Structures are given as structure tokens and as C-alpha cells.
Amino acid sequence: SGFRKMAFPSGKVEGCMVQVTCGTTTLNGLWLDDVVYCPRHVICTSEDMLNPNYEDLLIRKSNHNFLVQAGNVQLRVIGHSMQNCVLKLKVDTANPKTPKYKFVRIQPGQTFSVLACYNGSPSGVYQCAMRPNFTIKGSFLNGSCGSVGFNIDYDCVSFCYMHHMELPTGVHAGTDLEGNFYGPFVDRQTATAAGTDTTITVNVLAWLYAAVINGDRWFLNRFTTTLNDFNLVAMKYNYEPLTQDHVDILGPLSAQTGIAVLDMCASLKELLQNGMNGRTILGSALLEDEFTPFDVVRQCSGVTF
Amino acid sequence: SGFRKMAFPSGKVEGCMVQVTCGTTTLNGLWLDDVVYCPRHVICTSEDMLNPNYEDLLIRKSNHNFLVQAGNVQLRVIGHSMQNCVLKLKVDTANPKTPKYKFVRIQPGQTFSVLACYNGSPSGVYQCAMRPNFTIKGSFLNGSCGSVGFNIDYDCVSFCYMHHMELPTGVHAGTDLEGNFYGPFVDRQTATAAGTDTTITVNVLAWLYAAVINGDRWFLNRFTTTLNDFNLVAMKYNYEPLTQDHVDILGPLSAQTGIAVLDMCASLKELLQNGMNGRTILGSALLEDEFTPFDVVRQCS
Ligand SMILES: O=c1[nH]c(-c2cccc(Cl)c2)c(-n2nnc3ccccc32)c(=O)n1-c1cncc2ccccc12
Ligand SMILES: O=c1[nH]c(-c2cccc(Cl)c2)c(-n2nnc3ccccc32)c(=O)n1-c1cncc2ccccc12
Ligand SMILES: [Cl-]
Numbered sequence: 001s002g003f004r005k006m007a008f009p010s011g012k013v014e015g016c017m018v019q020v021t022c023g024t025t026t027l028n029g030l031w032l033d034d035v036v037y038c039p040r041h042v043i044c045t046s047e048d049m050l051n052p053n054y055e056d057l058l059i060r061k062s063n064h065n066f067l068v069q070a071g072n073v074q075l076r077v078i079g080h081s082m083q084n085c086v087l088k089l090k091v092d093t094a095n096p097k098t099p100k101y102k103f104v105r106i107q108p109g110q111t112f113s114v115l116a117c118y119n120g121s122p123s124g125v126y127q128c129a130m131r132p133n134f135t136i137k138g139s140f141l142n143g144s145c146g147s148v149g150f151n152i153d154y155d156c157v158s159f160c161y162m163h164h165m166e167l168p169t170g171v172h173a174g175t176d177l178e179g180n181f182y183g184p185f186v187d188r189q190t191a192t193a194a195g196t197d198t199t200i201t202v203n204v205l206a207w208l209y210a211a212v213i214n215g216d217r218w219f220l221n222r223f224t225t226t227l228n229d230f231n232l233v234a235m236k237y238n239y240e241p242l243t244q245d246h247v248d249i250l251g252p253l254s255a256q257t258g259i260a261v262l263d264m265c266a267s268l269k270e271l272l273q274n275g276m277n278g279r280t281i282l283g284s285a286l287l288e289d290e291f292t293p294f295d296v297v298r299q300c301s302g303v304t305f
Numbered sequence: 306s307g308f309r310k311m312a313f314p315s316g317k318v319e320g321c322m323v324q325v326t327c328g329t330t331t332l333n334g335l336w337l338d339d340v341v342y343c344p345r346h347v348i349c350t351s352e353d354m355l356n357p358n359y360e361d362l363l364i365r366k367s368n369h370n371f372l373v374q375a376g377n378v379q380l381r382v383i384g385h386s387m388q389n390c391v392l393k394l395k396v397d398t399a400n401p402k403t404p405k406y407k408f409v410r411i412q413p414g415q416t417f418s419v420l421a422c423y424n425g426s427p428s429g430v431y432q433c434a435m436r437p438n439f440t441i442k443g444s445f446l447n448g449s450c451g452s453v454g455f456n457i458d459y460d461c462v463s464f465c466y467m468h469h470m471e472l473p474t475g476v477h478a479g480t481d482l483e484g485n486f487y488g489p490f491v492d493r494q495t496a497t498a499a500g501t502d503t504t505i506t507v508n509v510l511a512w513l514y515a516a517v518i519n520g521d522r523w524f525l526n527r528f529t530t531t532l533n534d535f536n537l538v539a540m541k542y543n544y545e546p547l548t549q550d551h552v553d554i555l556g557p558l559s560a561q562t563g564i565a566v567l568d569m570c571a572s573l574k575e576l577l578q579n580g581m582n583g584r585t586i587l588g589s590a591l592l593e594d595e596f597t598p599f600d601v602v603r604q605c606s
């Protein structure tokens with residue numbers, strides 16, 4: 001029993017983190033096979049960050065301008081290229097600790113484990129969700145760029161996030177590993193801000209199932225709802241639409257608890273309309289929305305990697 | 306910016322996790338140099354657990370009755386010894402991935418990371434605290450025993466917890482890596498009562514400082530309190546007393562923010578007495594008590 005913010009074991013990713021230095025800037029890179037991936041703004045001075053044309057800025061660099069430190073060994077850079085916002089440094093040595101891996105782009109609401117690093121060295125690991133407004137509520141200090149987010153499935157690490165920037169309100173923006181930012185954010189100095197956010201409905205439902213699995217049941221009720229009737233209520237409370245796919249993905253939790261998804265939806269409807277009336281669910285006084293259905297299954301069923 | 310329940314990277318501990326089988330029971334062990342540590346109740350059946358004579362039960366076991374597997378590689382046990390409530394299984398091979406390590410016994414209120422494992426393989430990693438009643442609010446299923454808690458103190462892995470049992474409350478109890486239980490719990494079936502779980506006041510104050518560092522300031526006020534007067538309000542609300550040592554440990558955060566510790570006590574006093582009035586602090590509608598002062602400094606600077 002129990003339910004915690006639970007990250008994937010991070011060892012497979014730790015073995016891939018390196019330090020990348022260009023000029024007076026140091027940040028983190030991800031070393032997979034014979035390529036090191038890092039944010040392309042490693043080549044930028046703070047002065048460069050205004051209307052930068054990265055094609056100019058990168059042609060003014062050579063291989064010897066990049067210093068890649070992998071523990072006690074210096075990897076020699078033998079080529080470089082950029083894939084949209086991600087710089088790819090070709091090195092002379094394939095990382096012998098490369099895990100089985102994929103690059104995936106996740107959807108708003110999906111979660112991942114962040115391995116926060118400084119100077120190529122892992123510092124901590126925590127869970128994040130990609131918010132509907134395409135930010136993440138991370139914990140990142142100066143020097144954390146190039147830290148990555150990932151999920152694991154069996155023996156395969158699926159990298160889905162590379163950290164690039166902090167926004168004015170203290171939330172974070174970054175790219176997938178193929179170099180495309182999540183959301184309208186850009187690796188240049190602009191006066192932009194995160195937009196209005198919403199609550200990830202399918203995740204709140206997953207977490208209510210986690211609560212039932214752990215014995216917290218006070219919020220259940222006798223009612224059911226149709227999917228459309230639920231969504232008419234959800235929109236009023238700034239919740240994301242629940243799709244039929246979300247209902248399907250919640251199936252395993254419904255089977256394990258015996259509570260139909262639309263029955264859970266009626267429970268959530270009543271919590272939104274009445275509040276929690278001083279009670280708590282899994283130690284929280286708010287409805288938690290950064291556990292996916294799979295996060296609940298992997299934790300409550302003891303999946304290993 | 307930002308503030309998250311952050312665990313230490315688990316890779317150094319992953320390299321020490323092994324599977325330990327005795328009879329039909331499989332749980333986890335910790336492989337350091339040529340020794341594997343695991344809960345001694347691995348040798349018990351559920352019927353043995355009703356009234357176990359661990360000394361007699363261990364005498365009856367042989368080295369070959371302990372099956373140890375590191376990944377898909379089998380290790381041969383060449384000795385077995387009581388270590389309070391854990392077993393030390395001597396094996397043929399020193400673990401080549403043994404990190405620099407020490408065994409530390411932690412204090413109530415201190416935090417640590419847990420690598421939850423099943424059958425010798427890792428499931429996930431999370432942060433938790435040793436509660437004032439010497440339980441931990443973990444996430445553990447059947448088969449998780451032998452999973453360990455740890456901190457990474459600079460150049461060294463500090464192992465502080467090995468998991469042994471879930472109490473009827475759904476919270477968890479275990480030993481340090483010397484095999485001595487935290488709290489009054491025992492590795493046998495009892496009508497074990499758990500003490501009063503109280504809130505870790507020094508940690509709540511640390512987390513309020515984290516909130517100010519991150520820009521949440523609405524809860525500060527111009528009232529004042531003495532330490533004794535604050536502590537009277539604290540235990541009214543089932544908070545632990547705040548000691549002079551706690552005040553000094555909050556020194557670095559009070560210096561960074563410019564807010565005296567007793568002035569933050571005045572803020573916490575008002576929050577306890579009036580509530581939050583529908584506002585949140587660091588994304589929470591409740592006061593968080595599982596970040597130590599050290600956790601906040603580590604994460605915020
Ligand atoms: O580390 C970083 N480096 C840089 C940086 C980029 C280029 C050159 C240089 Cl010299 C630096 C960041 N910038 N700055 N302007 C940007 C504009 C668009 C994109 C990224 C940007 C940045 O946001 N972060 C940070 C990341 N996460 C948390 C942080 C907390 C506190 C301070 C910085 C944090
Ligand atoms: O895995 C475990 N194994 C055993 C066990 C011990 C001896 C023999 C056998 Cl055959 C089994 C546990 N027991 N049982 N009585 C005990 C009495 C004192 C100490 C430990 C005890 C135990 O509590 N746990 C568990 C640990 N954490 C979470 C759990 C969730 C759900 C079920 C079990 C959980
Ligand atoms: Cl809360």
C-alpha cells in the first residue's frame with residue numbers, strides 16, 4: 001500500500017549524461033551511441049539571444065570549440081549538426097552504456113521522469129507532466145539545461161524532453177529529442193509568457209482510482225454519467241475534455257477496482273461541484289493531476305525494469 | 306525556480322540490488338563488496354511468523370538454501386550470519402559496482418530516497434521521511450522487502466533503511482542496514498500499535514522558506530511570537546515542538562530570505578489558526594512536512 005510521486009529508476013539515463021562546454025557556457029548533454037545531444041543555445045552568449053539566427057551562429061563554430069567531458073575522459077568531437085533546436089555533436093567513441101532507447105514526443109497530460117543535472121552530473125530525479133499549456137512545472141536552476149525527461153517500458157528508455165529554458169512565472173519549457181519545442185516557446189529572448197493552464201482530467205481520474213486501490217473511497221457515489229454530460233461539467237471547471245480514448249486507457253484501473261469509468265466520472269463531477277469539504281485524498285487537499293493511468297498501474301502493480 | 310519532491314539518482318543503488326530466494330519466498334537484497342544484506346524473515350513461512358525462533362530457524366538453514374541472483378548471474382552463498390534483524394549472506398564475489406558507502410542511522414524528521422524493488426529489480430524511486438513515530442509513509446507491495454532507503458552525501462551512498470513490513474495502517478516499518486529496527490516494531494506478527502504521527506515542524510518551516518524563495522509571500526505577517534508561545538500553538542495542532550537546534554538549522558534559509566525564524570513561526574501560527582482561505586503554497590493546499598532544511602537549500606541553490 002501507499003502512493004507516492006514515483007520516478008523511473010534513473011541508472012540507465014545517468015550513464016548517458018555528459019558535460020558540454022562552449023566558450024564560457026557549460027550545460028548537460030545526452031550521450032547515446034556516438035552522438036551527444038544538447039540544447040543548441042549552448043553556442044550563444046546572452047547577447048546572441050536577441051533575434052538569433054542559429055545557422056549563422058553555428059557556422060562560426062568548429063569541432064574544437066566544443067568540449068565534452070564524460071566523467072574522467074574527454075570525448076573528441078568529430079562533427080556537429082543541428083536538428084531544429086537540438087545540437088548533435090558526433091564524437092569518436094560510442095557510449096558503451098547506451099541503453100535500448102527511442103525518441104518520442106509526448107502529448108499534453110503525459111508524465112515523465114526528469115533527471116536534473118549540473119555540469120554533466122546527475123543531481124536528482126522527480127516526476128513532471130507536460131501541462132496542457134505546454135510548460136512543465138519543473139525544478140531547475142541555472143546550469144540544468146540539457147537535463148532530460150524519459151519513461152521506461154521494459155528495457156527501453158523513451159526520451160521525451162530536453163530542458164531549455166525557464167519562463168517568467170518560474171515554469172519551464174523545452175523540446176523533444178528531435179529538436180521541436182513543446183508549445184509556442186522558442187530558444188530566443190522574447191516577451192512571451194505561459195498561457196492559461198487547465199487540469200488534466202484523465203489523470204485526476206487515474207489518481208482517484210489509485211485512491212480506491214489504497215482504501216480512500218469516501219468520494220465514490222451511486223451515480224453514473226455519459227461522457228458528453230461529464231464533459232459539459234468539466235469544461236466549466238477548466239478541466240481538459242475527456243475522450244473515448246481516455247475512457248479506454250482507464251479500463252485496466254476500472255477492471256482492477258470494479259468501478260466503471262463513467263461511474264468514476266460521476267464521482268469527479270460531484271467533487272468539482274461540492275468540493276472536498278475538508279477531507280483529503282491520498283494526503284492531498286487538491287485533486288492531483290500528474291499521475292497518468294499507466295503511472296498508477298506501474299506503481300500499484302509493482303512493474304519492474 | 307520550482308520545487309519538487311526530488312529523490313537522489315538511483316543508479317548507484319540499482320547496481321547493488323539482487324534477488325534473494327529462500328524456499329518459496331523471494332525478496333530483495335543489497336550486494337556490497339562480498340556480502341548480501343536482506344531481511345532475516347526471508348527464512349520464515351507465514352506460519353513461522355506467528356512465533357518465530359530466528360536463531361533456531363537460521364541454524365536449520367544451509368548456505369545452499371539461499372539462492373542469490375544478480376540480474377541473470379547467480380551468486381553462490383558461502384556463509385550466512387545473524388545481523389540483528391537482517392542477514393549477512395557472504396558470497397563468492399565482491400560486487401564490482403559497489404559504490405563508496407556507509408551505513409547511517411537517521412533521525413525522525415530526516416528524509417531519504419527509496420528504490421522500490423521486486424525480485425531484485427527496480428520498480429521506481431521516491432522521496433520520503435522518517436516520521437516522528439518511526440514509520441515511513443512509503444509505497445510498497447508484497448515482495449518489496451529488502452528495498453533500501455538512502456541519501457547521497459557528497460561522494461558516498463549513505464544507506465539508512467531496509468524495508469521489512471507494512472503495518473495495518475498501511476504505513477511501513479524497517480531497520481537500518483545494521484539490522485536494528487526504527488521504532489518499537491518487530492519482525493513477528495503482533496498487535497503492534499503505531500505511535501502518534503505528528504507533523505515535522507522544522508520541515509514545514511523549511512518549506513515555507515522554499516515558498517518565499519520561489520516568490521510566494523502572502524502568508525508573511527507583522528506579528529511576533531516567542532519560541533515557547535509558538536510551541537504551545539504547535540502541539541495544539543499535533544506539530545512537534547521546535548527546538549533551539551531546529552532554529553539554528555533554519556539559520557541558512559532565514560539568512561538568505563531575510564525572515565527571522567520566529568517571524569516565520571508567527572506566519573505558521575496564523576496558518577494553523579486560520580487556515581489558508583482557499584490559497585495555495587508551492588501548489589499545495591496543505592502544509593508540507595517532508596522537506597528538510599537541507600533538502601530546500603540543495604534544491605533551491
Ligand atoms: O540555465 C539556463 N541558461 C540559459 C541560457 C541560454 C542561452 C545562453 C545563456 Cl548564457 C544562458 C537560459 N535562457 N536565458 N534566456 C533564454 C531565452 C530562451 C531560451 C533559454 C534562455 C535559461 O533559461 N536557463 C535556465 C533554465 N532553467 C532554469 C533556470 C533558472 C535560473 C536561470 C536560468 C535557468
Ligand atoms: O512483503 C512482505 N512480506 C512479509 C512476510 C514476512 C515473513 C514471511 C512472509 Cl511469507 C512474508 C510481510 N510480513 N507479514 N507479516 C509480517 C510480520 C512482521 C514483519 C513482516 C511481515 C510484509 O509485511 N510484507 C510487506 C511489506 N511491504 C508492503 C506489503 C504490502 C502488502 C503485503 C505485504 C507487504
Ligand atoms: Cl494539497
